[PDB]
Amino acid sequence: LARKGTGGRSSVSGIVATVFGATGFLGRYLVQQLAKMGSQVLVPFRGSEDSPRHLKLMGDLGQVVPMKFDPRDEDSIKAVMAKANVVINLIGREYETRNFSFEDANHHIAEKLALVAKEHGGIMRYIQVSCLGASVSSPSRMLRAKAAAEEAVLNALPEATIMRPATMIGTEDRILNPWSMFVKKYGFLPLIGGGTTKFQPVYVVDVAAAIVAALKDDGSSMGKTYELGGPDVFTTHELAEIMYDMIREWPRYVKLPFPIAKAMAAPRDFMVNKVPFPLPSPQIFNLDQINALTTDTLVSDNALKFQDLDLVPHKLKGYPVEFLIQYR
Amino acid sequence: PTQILPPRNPVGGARVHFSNPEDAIEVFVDGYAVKVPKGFTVLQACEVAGVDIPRFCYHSRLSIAGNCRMCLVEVEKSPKPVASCAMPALPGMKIKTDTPIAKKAREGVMEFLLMNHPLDCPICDQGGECDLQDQSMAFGSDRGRFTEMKRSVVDKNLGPLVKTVMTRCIQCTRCVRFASEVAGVQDLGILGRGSGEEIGTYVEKLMTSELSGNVIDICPVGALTSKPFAFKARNWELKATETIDVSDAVGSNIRVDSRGPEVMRIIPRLNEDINEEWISDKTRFCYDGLKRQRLSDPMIRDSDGRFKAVSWRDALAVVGDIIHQVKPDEIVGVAGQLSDAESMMVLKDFVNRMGSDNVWCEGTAAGVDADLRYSYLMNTSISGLENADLFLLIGTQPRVEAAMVNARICKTVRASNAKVGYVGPPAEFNYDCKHLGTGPDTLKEIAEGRHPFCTALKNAKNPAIIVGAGLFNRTDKNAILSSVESIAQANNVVRPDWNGLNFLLQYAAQAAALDLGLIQQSAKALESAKFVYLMGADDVNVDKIPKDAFVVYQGHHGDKAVYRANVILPASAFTEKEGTYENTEGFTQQTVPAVPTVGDARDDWKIVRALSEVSGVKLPYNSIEGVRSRIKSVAPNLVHTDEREPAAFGPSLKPECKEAMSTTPFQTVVENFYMTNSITRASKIMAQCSAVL
Amino acid sequence: KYSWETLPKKWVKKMERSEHGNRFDTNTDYLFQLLCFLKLHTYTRVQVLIDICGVDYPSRKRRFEVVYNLLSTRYNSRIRVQTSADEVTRISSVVSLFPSAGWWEREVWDMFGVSFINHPDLRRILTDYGFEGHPLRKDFPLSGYVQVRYDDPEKRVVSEPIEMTQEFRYFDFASPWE
Amino acid sequence: IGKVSGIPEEHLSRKVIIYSPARTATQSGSGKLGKWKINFVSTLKWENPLMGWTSTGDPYANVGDSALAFDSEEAAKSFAERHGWDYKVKKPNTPLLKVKSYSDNFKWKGN
Amino acid sequence: GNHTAKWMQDRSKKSPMELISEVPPIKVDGRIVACEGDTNPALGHPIEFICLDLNEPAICKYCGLRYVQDH
Amino acid sequence: VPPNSANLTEARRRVFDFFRAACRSIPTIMDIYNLQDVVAPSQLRYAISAQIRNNAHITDPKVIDLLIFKGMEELTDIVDHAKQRHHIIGQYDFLKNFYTSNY
Amino acid sequence: KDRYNASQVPAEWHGWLHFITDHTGDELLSLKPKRYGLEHKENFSGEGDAYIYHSKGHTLNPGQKNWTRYQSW
Amino acid sequence: WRGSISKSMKELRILLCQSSPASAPTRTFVEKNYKDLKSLNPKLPILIRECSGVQPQMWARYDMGVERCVNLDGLTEPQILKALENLVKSGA
Numbered sequence A: 001l002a003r004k005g006t007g008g009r010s011s012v013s014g015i016v017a018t019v020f021g022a023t024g025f026l027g028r029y030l031v032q033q034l035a036k037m038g039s040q041v042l043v044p045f046r047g048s049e050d051s052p053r054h055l056k057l058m059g060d061l062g063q064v065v066p067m068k069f070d071p072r073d074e075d076s077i078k079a080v081m082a083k084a085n086v087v088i089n090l091i092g093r094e095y096e097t098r099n100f101s102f103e104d105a106n107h108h109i110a111e112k113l114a115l116v117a118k119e120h121g122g123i124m125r126y127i128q129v130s131c132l133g134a135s136v137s138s139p140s141r142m143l144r145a146k147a148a149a150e151e152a153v154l155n156a157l158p159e160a161t162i163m164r165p166a167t168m169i170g171t172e173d174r175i176l177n178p179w180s181m182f183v184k185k186y187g188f189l190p191l192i193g194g195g196t197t198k199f200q201p202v203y204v205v206d207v208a209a210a211i212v213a214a215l216k217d218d219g220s221s222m223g224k225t226y227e228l229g230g231p232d233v234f235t236t237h238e239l240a241e242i243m244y245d246m247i248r249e250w251p252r253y254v255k256l257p258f259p260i261a262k263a264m265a266a267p268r269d270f271m272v273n274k275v276p277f278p279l280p281s282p283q284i285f286n287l288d289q290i291n292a293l294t295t296d297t298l299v300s301d302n303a304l305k306f307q308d309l310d311l312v313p314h315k316l317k318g319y320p321v322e323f324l325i326q327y328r
Numbered sequence B: 001p002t003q004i005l006p007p008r009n010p011v012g013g014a015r016v017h018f019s020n021p022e023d024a025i026e027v028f029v030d031g032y033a034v035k036v037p038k039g040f041t042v043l044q045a046c047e048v049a050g051v052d053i054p055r056f057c058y059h060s061r062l063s064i065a066g067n068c069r070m071c072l073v074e075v076e077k078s079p080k081p082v083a084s085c086a087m088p089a090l091p092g093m094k095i096k097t098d099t100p101i102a103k104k105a106r107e108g109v110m111e112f113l114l115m116n117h118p119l120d121c122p123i124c125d126q127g128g129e130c131d132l133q134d135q136s137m138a139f140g141s142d143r144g145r146f147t148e149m150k151r152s153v154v155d156k157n158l159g160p161l162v163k164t165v166m167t168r169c170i171q172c173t174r175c176v177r178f179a180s181e182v183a184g185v186q187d188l189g190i191l192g193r194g195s196g197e198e199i200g201t202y203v204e205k206l207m208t209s210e211l212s213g214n215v216i217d218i219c220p221v222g223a224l225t226s227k228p229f230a231f232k233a234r235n236w237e238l239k240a241t242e243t244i245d246v247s248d249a250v251g252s253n254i255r256v257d258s259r260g261p262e263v264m265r266i267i268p269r270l271n272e273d274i275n276e277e278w279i280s281d282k283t284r285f286c287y288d289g290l291k292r293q294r295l296s297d298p299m300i301r302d303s304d305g306r307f308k309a310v311s312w313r314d315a316l317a318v319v320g321d322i323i324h325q326v327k328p329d330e331i332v333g334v335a336g337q338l339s340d341a342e343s344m345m346v347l348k349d350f351v352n353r354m355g356s357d358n359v360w361c362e363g364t365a366a367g368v369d370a371d372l373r374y375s376y377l378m379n380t381s382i383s384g385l386e387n388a389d390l391f392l393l394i395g396t397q398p399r400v401e402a403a404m405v406n407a408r409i410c411k412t413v414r415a416s417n418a419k420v421g422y423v424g425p426p427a428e429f430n431y432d433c434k435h436l437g438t439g440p441d442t443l444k445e446i447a448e449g450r451h452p453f454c455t456a457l458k459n460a461k462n463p464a465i466i467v468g469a470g471l472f473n474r475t476d477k478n479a480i481l482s483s484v485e486s487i488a489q490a491n492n493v494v495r496p497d498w499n500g501l502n503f504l505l506q507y508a509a510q511a512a513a514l515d516l517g518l519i520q521q522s523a524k525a526l527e528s529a530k531f532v533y534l535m536g537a538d539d540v541n542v543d544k545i546p547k548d549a550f551v552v553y554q555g556h557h558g559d560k561a562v563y564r565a566n567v568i569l570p571a572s573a574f575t576e577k578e579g580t581y582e583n584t585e586g587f588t589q590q591t592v593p594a595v596p597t598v599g600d601a602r603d604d605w606k607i608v609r610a611l612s613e614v615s616g617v618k619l620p621y622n623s624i625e626g627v628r629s630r631i632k633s634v635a636p637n638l639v640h641t642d643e644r645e646p647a648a649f650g651p652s653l654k655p656e657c658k659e660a661m662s663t664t665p666f667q668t669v670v671e672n673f674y675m676t677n678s679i680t681r682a683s684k685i686m687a688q689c690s691a692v693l
Numbered sequence C: 001k002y003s004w005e006t007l008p009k010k011w012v013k014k015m016e017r018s019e020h021g022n023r024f025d026t027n028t029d030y031l032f033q034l035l036c037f038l039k040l041h042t043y044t045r046v047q048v049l050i051d052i053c054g055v056d057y058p059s060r061k062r063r064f065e066v067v068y069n070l071l072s073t074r075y076n077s078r079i080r081v082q083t084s085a086d087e088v089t090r091i092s093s094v095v096s097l098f099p100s101a102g103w104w105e106r107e108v109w110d111m112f113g114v115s116f117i118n119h120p121d122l123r124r125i126l127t128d129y130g131f132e133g134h135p136l137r138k139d140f141p142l143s144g145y146v147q148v149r150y151d152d153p154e155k156r157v158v159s160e161p162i163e164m165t166q167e168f169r170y171f172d173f174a175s176p177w178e
Numbered sequence D: 001i002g003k004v005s006g007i008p009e010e011h012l013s014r015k016v017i018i019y020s021p022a023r024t025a026t027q028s029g030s031g032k033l034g035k036w037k038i039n040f041v042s043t044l045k046w047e048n049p050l051m052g053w054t055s056t057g058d059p060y061a062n063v064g065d066s067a068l069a070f071d072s073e074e075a076a077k078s079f080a081e082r083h084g085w086d087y088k089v090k091k092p093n094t095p096l097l098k099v100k101s102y103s104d105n106f107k108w109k110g111n
Numbered sequence E: 001g002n003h004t005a006k007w008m009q010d011r012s013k014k015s016p017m018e019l020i021s022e023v024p025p026i027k028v029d030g031r032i033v034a035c036e037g038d039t040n041p042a043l044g045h046p047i048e049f050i051c052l053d054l055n056e057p058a059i060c061k062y063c064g065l066r067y068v069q070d071h
Numbered sequence F: 001v002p003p004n005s006a007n008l009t010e011a012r013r014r015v016f017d018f019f020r021a022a023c024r025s026i027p028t029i030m031d032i033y034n035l036q037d038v039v040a041p042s043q044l045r046y047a048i049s050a051q052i053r054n055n056a057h058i059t060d061p062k063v064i065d066l067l068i069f070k071g072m073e074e075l076t077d078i079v080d081h082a083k084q085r086h087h088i089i090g091q092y093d094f095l096k097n098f099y100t101s102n103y
Numbered sequence G: 001k002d003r004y005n006a007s008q009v010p011a012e013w014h015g016w017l018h019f020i021t022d023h024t025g026d027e028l029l030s031l032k033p034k035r036y037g038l039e040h041k042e043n044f045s046g047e048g049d050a051y052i053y054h055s056k057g058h059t060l061n062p063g064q065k066n067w068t069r070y071q072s073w
Numbered sequence H: 001w002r003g004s005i006s007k008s009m010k011e012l013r014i015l016l017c018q019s020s021p022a023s024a025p026t027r028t029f030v031e032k033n034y035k036d037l038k039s040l041n042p043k044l045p046i047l048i049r050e051c052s053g054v055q056p057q058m059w060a061r062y063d064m065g066v067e068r069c070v071n072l073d074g075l076t077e078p079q080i081l082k083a084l085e086n087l088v089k090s091g092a
């Protein structure tokens, strides 16, 4: 955009972004890309002010302005998107919480940010982030919601990019860090469904590099739902094989039939019932993540891949997984 | 005992000009002999000895004065400290610049100057760059005994350029001499006597003269300061680049004093061969342009009529497509008056390989003769005009266009009593002008020796005949130039050692253009032409271009060409780039980039070469040094920078002549001089200088 | 001064001063030999290498000037033996005579780049570990070349990218007339 | 001596200008002349959008003017050629001490 | 004003330009005034001697105070 | 180490000495910083050789001495855990510029 | 008695209370300037925006000024 | 002396040099030939350009911007004129 600089960390890029999901595992890499290529980031946080503290750095003195906002209350989303031209949406959950349901956290928000950005005429690029294979009739209610979110962000706001990152790996992720700390149940890894799932993980740095690459691009990458798949189409068991290469442990997997898992994840699905107590965020056994685990639709079809962003993803061996060394 | 004395070279590397190596007077500056030509004041006999004598009113360009006694060196056998500025060095004179009597005299005077002087140093615009502050902090006493009521003076209104605080002014008379002599307008005066002395116009009279903004550099005190540079910066913040100027084709030297990304103040700098230490008020206060109305994003035209600030890929793509889908002979490449040599070379090499030959500078009218380089140069150097005996300014109004050429003409009318003849429109001249005639008829009257001034032009030893390129626009340009060269051959003007024939130009690019052969062959270009490619040309008549022409204005400001432009390409200014310029006398300066380009602007040559590669034509070079090698190919004059390359071919090669038009007398080529180009038109200072007329 | 009479004339090669502290601007070859003199000598007993001040004159041909200060706790006097070694001239090291010269010469090499001959453990002492460039030179910009360091997705790591900061404002205070 | 100097590669292909700063036209004093300075063009200076102040990105922003001033074109050229810069020396324009005297103000215009 | 609209975004406290343009000009006797500052010559600006030959008030550049001849 | 480089011959000899030192030290480099899986010994030898060859046109002996000293400094600070590892893995036309900036 | 912190002590007393002077705030209140005198502000550092201070480009300050010295076209 | 230059070439650039020992044959050629050449081609840009030391060349721009470079390093006046004749012939 109106870029006046050389690199970043003091440059300008005319991108005063509001990364709605910045205080999150994908958010810290995307905010660092947007604010290391020298552009403002209006990180909106939901609760504790300690959430975006790790984002006050990685941006030079107001290039990252953490702001407070209530997800269900507008006139605050409009205040966060007051001075903005890019609005990325990383607000998503893999687990239903007693207060915010799957739609009220994946679909009824993305549609709401879409509408309140449409109203705030001036949002040049609105990126919408949803999981890969999030198409309607997918088992996991998280993916059906995330599909409705795409359909409502494109309808209510055309020329709005839609990344489709598959399960993203990296430090502080929700895919590998639960498996480790469950290998700390004495090497016991419960790969569910027998590892027949075929899903294409991707180094979160490269998902961020794609989310920024659709901003730095021209008028293209508007309304075109990418699929940030990644290389080396894996299987859950095979991906676990690479963890045990980093964390020094001996592969001691077990297979779990899907009924056994869905029964093991039958608790923590009474979230709307147990009102006077919030449940502890089901990490590995998530009935909805399991419904997604069943069908191996998490593979990039002939839709737009990283190749349509002049970008090639990193592998999943070596550094893009070296966050596991802290578990040795 | 085998000592190592310092070299003792002149004060500023000052070239000492012996009129002959025989009359070298030898004087002792602090017991160190120095050989100075006959007539050197003691101050110059010390500036030859490296001794810097503190001077308040002694300017080398200006006359000599005793309005203050800050120098007072003690010569050997005089009863009183002699003012060094006026005492001519006599052979054997012993000058003691640091003897206790000299230092006490300097401290005495610097106490008197700081006695009635107000404590305005914090609020003084020239607080850091002050002769009074730097002479008090170096030669004047550390304390002042005057504790009484200083005198104070009201602030005279001297126009929208020179802010005046006469209380600070020390009445050294330097400006009242500069306006009387160099500027030659005679408006300033030392009204009154005693401490009540007040410098300025007795009646409220804006300094209507151009070239009168240099009084601030002349002024050794804050008193006279740039009102545009009201207080915006300080003498220490300003990072200085030794750039050149492009407003007028004199190509005056300059220091673009910039603070960060913007040009705070444009100040002259010594270059004895173009502008001694003076720059026109068109150059001092055009810096305000470079920050107003700048084009910062490449805007193409949508399906409505308003612009759309697309990126560079899209704008270059649309321009390339529209040149691919047009007939070749319909491409024209009008190049702006501020365009450097490189970008004009790139424009030529682009619109050439596109199958056209319709590139030309903005000012050069149809059928210019750019073959022989004397035909558009000031063959006699701008310094050479100091040796001229008689001038014949054929039109050319040199006070208006090429103001430093007129400054040299006025200096060499005052110093050596030269007499000028003027065949042009009725104008106002600093000096005695002796207007001859209004039209070309009186030019024939001189060509045929039937004029009372032809007998003057004959008898003069070294004559000069300035013919402004403003009369190339007339249809009978060959006839006028033939009569000019007839006057030359008749009065022995252009002779092997003088070459008094010289044409001045009014556009900075015009010399470099006519050097690269950027000639408008004829009309029927810019008409029946469908890819007009204005390269920063605002003064091109956009009423000539056909309505269906896809004008692509690669300017940096845009006044009227931008409104017509079907696609804009924002370029850099003259300070933001590094462009090789050629002034009228053939001197080839080279600007040095001061401030960063605004927004998403690019270099002129970069834009044209990128448009070339987008539009398919593979152009050999890809850098600034490459295109300078291409210039060396097409015109090596514009590669040997900072060196004038005289044209070794007189007018005896121009083929033949025609008849000069009786009607249509010489027309004023520059109407304003305060709005001559785009930088100057979009400025907030030049506009409002319209009151200065 | 007594020290100049006894000293071999060749050792005080280039220069010699006589105020603001006296100095023997010597040659780099005769330096540690000159430092051997003035120490372990009965009438000139310095024994104390106070300081080794690298000084960079860009306009010289021998850029640097390794100014060895020397105190004489016995005779209560201070002599400043100097040298001159450009960027690629290994100069003799006097860590063998005054063992305090170890760190001072590490600092002279770090800041400037005047490598020291047979100096054991000649390793960058002051600047950063991966520091490339020699700071206290003149041509080394104040803000450094690549010396910003910020945290990033390469967690627990501070990168070393190219530098960008509010531009250091150099003020041209220096006035004419000196 | 460019490679051993630790300067990064991208700043040894820099194009400098070895000028001699002309006299400040405002003050008629030659006490700052004859100090040749390399001029790393260093034109890229944006405005840090939080506060009004500027913000360079080139490391050689100030050292061209500040603290790096030689005393002769030969030493400055030797410096900019050791380090491998592409120096274009811009000669300093010096003044002619033309003979002038006081008694020329009171010249007689004959009649 | 417009200059004062560059540094002050409050726009409720009176702009210093108005605070000084609303103070009346000070009558005096002679043709030159002192305006050493507020009152204490050491807590004000360097003494600025102003000329009152004109009819209109001549402002003190440092303090904005205005003086008239009062003949 | 005294600059015995009174000629390019001794300097080249000690260049080969430093090259042999770095090559025979690559084992510990790969061990301490864990590159035995990302990089091959052929590739690290390739990089060291491309370094020593990138600066091979040095007709000055003392400049070669100083280059070898900087290289030994780099190595000794890579052998020991003085510098980190995420740089060691990194240590191992006109139009496309014009579109980005003006420089 | 709750929510107190330093810097709530106005300038009239912040002298007497740090022993810099011996003039109680009831004595310096005849010296506080009436024309430009401003009440204290407790140093609202962190207590929500529009109480905290903001520069003129922070994007939280109402009226975020643009510093581009060049006036675009 | 050729006449058909304005209809074949687009411009002719002769990079003689001011006062070199060499490039003097080029100056003689121009001095003796340019008057007649331009009187015969009243509109062609026959560009004469000076220098300090540039080898005396003779360039020529044809239709589509191509350029023949003929170096007159030692060619005499008739040799230079024959070179120009070859230039004119190689464009038509």
Ligand SMILES: NC(=O)C1=CN([C@@H]2O[C@H](COP(=O)(O)OP(=O)(O)OC[C@H]3O[C@@H](n4cnc5c(N)ncnc54)[C@H](OP(=O)(O)O)[C@@H]3O)[C@@H](O)[C@H]2O)C=CC1
Pocket: A020, A021, A022, A023, A024, A025, A026, A027, A045, A046, A047, A051, A071, A089, A090, A091, A092, A093, A094, A100, A104, A105, A129, A130, A131, A132, A165, A166, A167, A168, A169, A173, A174, A175
């Ligand atoms: N993690 C993965 O492996 C995959 C994730 N994705 C998608 O990437 C995006 C970001 O991922 P990641 O950062 O790991 O996700 P997280 O679950 O860690 O949440 C990221 C952000 O979402 C915000 N958020 C979530 N739900 C709500 C809500 N109801 N109201 C307000 N804010 C909310 C969080 O706020 P707070 O921190 O305060 O809770 C945080 O800022 C999501 O759309 C996610 O589904 C794509 C592929 C798979």
Ligand code: SF4
Pocket: B117, B118, B119, B120, B121, B122, B124, B125, B126, B127, B128, B130, B131, B132, B133, B168, B220, B221, B222, B223
């Ligand atoms: S001219 Fe200005 S800065 Fe210099 S001494 Fe006088 S008041 Fe002070």
Ligand code: SF4
Pocket: B168, B169, B170, B171, B172, B173, B174, B175, B176, B199, B218, B219, B220, B221, B223, B224
């Ligand atoms: S106004 Fe300036 S130049 Fe004129 S007499 Fe006063 S101090 Fe000298």
Ligand code: FES
Pocket: B043, B054, B055, B056, B057, B058, B065, B066, B067, B068, B069, B070, B071, B072, B083, B084, B085, B086
């Ligand atoms: S300047 Fe020479 S004495 Fe006044």
Ligand SMILES: [Zn+2]
Pocket: E035, E036, E037, E045, E048, E060, E061, E062, E063, E064, E065
């Ligand atoms: Zn006052």
